[PDB]
C-alpha cells in the first residue's frame with residue numbers, strides 16, 4: 001500500500017517464502033479445527049478475514 | 064438418608080463471568096451507537112435513514128428481549144440410587160408414585176400403525192413397577208385400523224416385554240433396536256442371549272407382516288360398513304357421528320406374559336363426536352383423557368407423548384420422580400420437561416432440524432427462572448396443578464360443579480390429595496361412568512379449556528397451557544439425561560418444515576391477540592418473575608421481527624441504486640464504535656459456544672436460518688394474523704410460493720451490486736471510498752440469503768452445477784455491459 | 791410377487807423386503823430359499839473351477855460319448 005511501484009519488485013520473493021511456509025503449516029490446522037470437508041466453517045473464516053482487514057486498516061492509520 | 068435426590072450445579076464461574084461482562088459491554092456500546100444514530104441526521108434524504116434507524120431500534124429491542132433472560136444458566140444432575148434406596152427399600156410394599164401416559168393418535172392415513180405400535184411397545188416395556196403405570200390412547204378418528212393394531216400389539220407385548228426386561232435393552236423399541244449399526248454384543252454377558260434374540264427377531268418380523276396385512280385389509284372400504292368379530296357393527300362407521308367407546312387390555316383381568324408378570328394396563332378411548340358442537344383438535348382429547356383417568360385410575364402425575372416419539376431411556380419417569388417426589392426442592396414444581404431429540408437426521412443440517420440453540424442455550428439458561436416453557440410432547444405434569452390449584456404452604460358441591468363437570472364421582476376423585484380412587488371400587492360403576500365423562504356436552508357451564516387442563520387456544524395450545532400455571536406460584540424444571548429420554552422422527556422434506564414454521568408462527572401471532580397475552584396478563588398479583596415474562600414476550604413476538612427485517616434487507620440496495628449513502632461518514636468518531644459493535648457480537652458468540660457446547664456449524668446454521676425463515680414465512684403468518692383480526696387462500700399455501708420474497712430480495716441486492724460495479728467503472732478513484740460500506744451491507748445480506756438457495760437448487764455438494772453458474776455469470780456480465788452502453 | 795425376479799439382484803437390495811408383504815409364511819420360505827440360492831452359487835463356482843483345467847484327450851459327457859465341442863472351430867450342430 002505504501003509502495004509506489006518502485007518497490008514492487010523485491011517483496012515478491014519474501015511473499016513467496018512466507019507463502020511456502022504458510023501452505024506447509026495451514027492444512028493440518030484446517031483439518032484439526034474443522035469437522036467438515038473443504039473449509040471448516042464459512043462465516044467464521046469470513047469474519048476472521050474481516051477482522052484481519054480491519055486490523056490492517058488500524059495499522060495503516062497508525063503506522 | 065437425608066440427601067436431596069438431585070442437585071442444581073451452576074455453570075462454572077470462570078466460564079460465565081466474561082460472558083456476562085461482554086453482554087454488559089455490548090449493551091453499553093449499542094446504547095451509545097443508537098444515540099449517535101439518533102443525533103445525526105442526513106438532510107440529503109431522510110426517508111431511508113428513518114427507515115434504517117427504526118429497523119435498528121427494533122433489532123436492538125429484540126436483542127435485549129432475547130439475551131437478557133440468559134443470566135445464571137444452570138444444569139441439573141440426579142441421584143437415582145438414593146431414590147431406589149429410600150422408596151424401593153426391600154421388605155415393604157413399593158411406594159413410588161403412579162403415573163398415566165397419554166398417547167394421542169389422529170388418523171392412521173398419515174401416521175402408520177407401525178409407528179404408533181412402536182411407541183406403545185416402548186411405553187409398555189418401561190422400567191418401573193408394573194402396578195403403577197397405565198397407557199391411555201385417544202384415537203380421534205375412531206377408525207378400526209388403530210383398534211386392530213392395538214389388539215395386535217397387546218398380543219405381541221406378552222413376548223416383547225419379558226425379553227426386554229431380562230437382558231436390559233437400550234432402546235426398548237423393536238424397529239429402533241433391530242436397526243442399530245452398533246454391535247449388539249458389546250456388553251451382553253448372559254449365555255442364552257444370542258439364541259433368544261434371534262428367536263425374537265423372527266417374531267417381530269411376523270408381527271410386522273400381520274400389521275401390513277391389517278393395513279391392506281382396511282384399505283378397502285365395505286359398502287354397508289365395518290364388521291366386528293362378535294357380530295354387532297363397528298360404532299365408528301360414521302366418522303363424524305359415533306358414541307363414546309372405551310376398552311381395556313393387558314390389565315389385571317388380562318392374561319399374563321410368558322414368565323407370569325401381568326402387563327401394564329392399556330385402555331383405548333374414543334370420545335363421542337356428535338355433529339353440531341365445537342371440537343378442539345388436541346386440547347379436547349387430552350382433557351377427555353385427564354377426565355377419564357380420574358375415574359379409572361387416579362395418578363398424581365402424568366406423561367404425554369406423540370405417536371412418532373418413542374421412549375429411548377427406560378428410566379425417564381424414574382428420573383423425573385427424583386424431582387417430583389422430593390418434599391424439599393420438588394414441593395412447588397408443576398412439571399418436568401425433557402428436550403426434543405430427533406432420530407434419522409443427516410450429518411448435514413439441510414434446514415435446521417436439530418434445534419441446538421433453543422434446547423441447549425435458551426431453555427438451559429432459562430431453567431434458573433421458574434423452569435422452561437412447555438413444548439409439545441415429552442413432559443411430565445402434576446395432576447393437582449392442571450386443576451388450577453395454587454402450590455401448597457401458602458351447599459359446597461355447587462362451586463365444584465361450576466368448576467369442572469356435574470359428575471359426582473370424578474369431582475370426588477379430584478379431592479384426593481395424592482392418588483387413590485373414589486370408594487365405589489366396583490368396576491361396573493366406574494366403567495359405566497367413564498363413558499358418561501366423555502359426553503359431547505360435558506364442557507359447557509364449566510371452566511375446562513379456559514382455566515383448567517389444556518387451554519383452548521387457537522392452533523398451538525402448549526405455550527398457553529404452561530403459561531397459565533407459570534402465572535401462578537408454580538415452578539417447572541428442565542431435565543437432560545445423559546441417555547436421551549424420548550427420541551422422535553424428523554420431518555422428511557422442506558415443505559413440511561415450512562408448513563411447520565408457518566403453523567408455529569401463526570399460533571404465536573394469535574396468542575399475541577387474546578387476554579392470555581404474556582405482555583399484560585396478570586400484572587397485578589405478580590407470582591410470575593419478570594425474566595420469565597420477558598422470555599414469554601420473546602416467544603410471542605419473535606415473528607414480528609420479520610417486518611422491519613425485510614426493510615433492512617432492501618435498504619442497502621435501495622440506496623445503492625441511486626443515493627449510495629445512509630449516514631455521513633466520520634472516521635474519528637463513528638468508526639471505533641462501529642468496529643466495537645461487531646467485536647462485541649463476535650465475543651458474545653465465542654463465549655456462548657464456550658459454555659453451551661454447541662458446535663460452530665450448528666451455531667451459524669441457526670444464525671442464518673433466522674433470516675432465511677423469517678423472510679419466508681413469518682411475514683406471511685403476520686399477514687394471516689392481521690387479516691383474520693381485521694376480518695372480525697386462507698388455508699395452507701404451496702411450498703414454492705413461500706420462498707419468493709427472499710428470492711426477490713436477493714435478486715434486487717444482486718442488481719444493486721451490478722449497479723455499484725457500473726458506478727465503480729464510472730468512478731475515477733475520487734468516489735472509490737463511500738461505496739465500500741454499501742457493498743459490505745449488500746454482501747452481508749447476500750451471504751445470509753444465498754446458501755439456502757444453493758442447497759435447494761443443487762442436489763450436488765459445493766456448487767450446484769458448473770456451466771449453468773458460469774453462464775449465469777456470463778449473462779450478468781453481458782447485461783451490465785448493455786447497461787453501461789445505455790446508462 | 792417378487793419385484794426383480796432375479797436372484798442376485800433381489801437378495802442384494804438395500805430396501806426393506808417386508809414393505810408390503812402380507813402372507814404369514816413369507817419370512818420362513820424366503821429364508822429357506824436364500825440358502826438354496828447360495829448352494830446353487832456354490833455349485834456354479836465348483837463347475838467353473840472344474841472347467842478351468844483342460845484335459846488332454848478332451849471333454850467327457852456323463853453318458854460316455856465325448857463332448858462334440860472339443861474342437862471349438864469345428865463341431866456339428868447340436869440342440870437339446
Ligand SMILES: OC[C@H]1O[C@@H](O[C@H]2[C@H](O)[C@@H](O)[C@H](O)O[C@@H]2CO)[C@H](O)[C@@H](O)[C@@H]1O
Pocket residue numbers: 122123125126129648651652673
Ligand atoms: O448474537 C446474534 C443475535 O443477533 C441478533 O440480531 C443482531 C444482529 O447483529 C443484527 O440483526 C442487528 O444488526 O443487531 C442485532 C443485535 O444483536 C438476533 O436478533 C438474534 O436472534 C441473534 O441471536
Ligand SMILES: OC[C@H]1O[C@@H](O[C@H]2[C@H](O)[C@@H](O)[C@H](O)O[C@@H]2CO)[C@H](O)[C@@H](O)[C@@H]1O
Pocket residue numbers: 403418421437438439523525526567568570571602605
Ligand atoms: O420446539 C417446539 C416449539 O417450538 C416453538 O418455536 C420456537 C422454535 O423452535 C425456535 O427455533 C425459535 O428460536 O423460537 C421459537 C419460539 O419458541 C413454537 O413456538 C412452539 O409452538 C413449539 O411447541
